[PDB]
Amino acid sequence: DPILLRPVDDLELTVRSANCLKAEAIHYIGDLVQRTEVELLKTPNLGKKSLTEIKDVLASRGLSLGMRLENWP
Amino acid sequence: FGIDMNTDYTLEEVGKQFDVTRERIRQIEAKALRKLRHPSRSEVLRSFLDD
């Protein structure tokens, strides 16, 4: 899908989450959604609000965490 | 700009309207522009630039 290879640039996220994901260094979401909840809570200095925001931006476009992919990217 | 009003205003008149210096107003304008530049608020907008 073109969108999970669409950068976190275009998630319309807040810059706090920007710092979190820059630390994690996940540019596209095709590997983002295979990661679980604790794999996101392994973030440096990241808590409930930013992660609820990221699940918000996922379920705005019809996705979430934990999904499985094949030959990605 | 003059968007849907009378005369556009300099930054200082705007800071007057919000009790800020013009630098505060430049920060606000730049942040709003950066927000709008991204698609999902800008797909149709940039399509108005038909080229």
UniProtKB/Swiss-Prot annotation, chain A:
Keywords: Acetylation, ADP-ribosylation, DNA-directed RNA polymerase, Nucleotidyltransferase, Transcription, Transferase. GO terms for biological process: bacterial-type flagellum assembly; bacterial-type flagellum-dependent cell motility; cell motility; cellular response to cell envelope stress; DNA-templated transcription initiation; intracellular iron ion homeostasis; nitrate assimilation; regulation of DNA-templated transcription elongation. Signal peptide: none annotated. Residues 1-73 are annotated as: Alpha C-terminal domain (alpha-CTD). The modification ADP-ribosylarginine is found at residue 16. GO terms for molecular function: DNA binding; DNA-directed RNA polymerase activity; protein dimerization activity. The modification N6-acetyllysine is found at residues 48-49. One of its GO terms (cellular component) is transcription elongation factor complex. Acetylated on Lys-48 and Lys-49 in the presence of glucose. PatZ controls acetylation of Lys-49 but not of Lys-48. (Microbial infection) ADP-ribosylated on both alpha subunits by the phage T4 protein ModA. ADP-ribosylated on only one of the alpha subunits by the phage T4 protein Alt. DNA-dependent RNA polymerase (RNAP) catalyzes the transcription of DNA into RNA using the four ribonucleoside triphosphates as substrates. This subunit plays an important role in subunit assembly since its dimerization is the first step in the sequential assembly of subunits to form the holoenzyme. Part of the processive rRNA transcription and antitermination complex (rrnTAC). The complex forms an RNA-chaperone ring around the RNA exit tunnel of RNAP. It supports rapid transcription and antitermination of rRNA operons, cotranscriptional rRNA folding, and annealing of distal rRNA regions to allow correct ribosome biogenesis. Homodimer. The RNAP catalytic core consists of 2 alpha, 1 beta, 1 beta' and 1 omega subunit. When a sigma factor is associated with the core the holoenzyme is formed, which can initiate transcription. Both the N- and C-terminus interact with different regions of transcriptional regulator CRP. The rRNA transcription and antitermination complex (rrnTAC) consists of RNAP, NusA, NusB, NusE (rpsJ), NusG, SubB, ribosomal protein S4, DNA and precursor rRNA; S4 is more flexible than other subunits. Belongs to the RNA polymerase alpha chain family. The N-terminal domain is essential for RNAP assembly and basal transcription, whereas the C-terminal domain is involved in interaction with transcriptional regulators (such as CRP) and with upstream promoter elements. This is DNA-directed RNA polymerase subunit alpha. The lineage of its organism: Bacteria, Pseudomonadati, Pseudomonadota, Gammaproteobacteria, Enterobacterales. The chain holds residues 250 to 322 of 329 of the full protein.
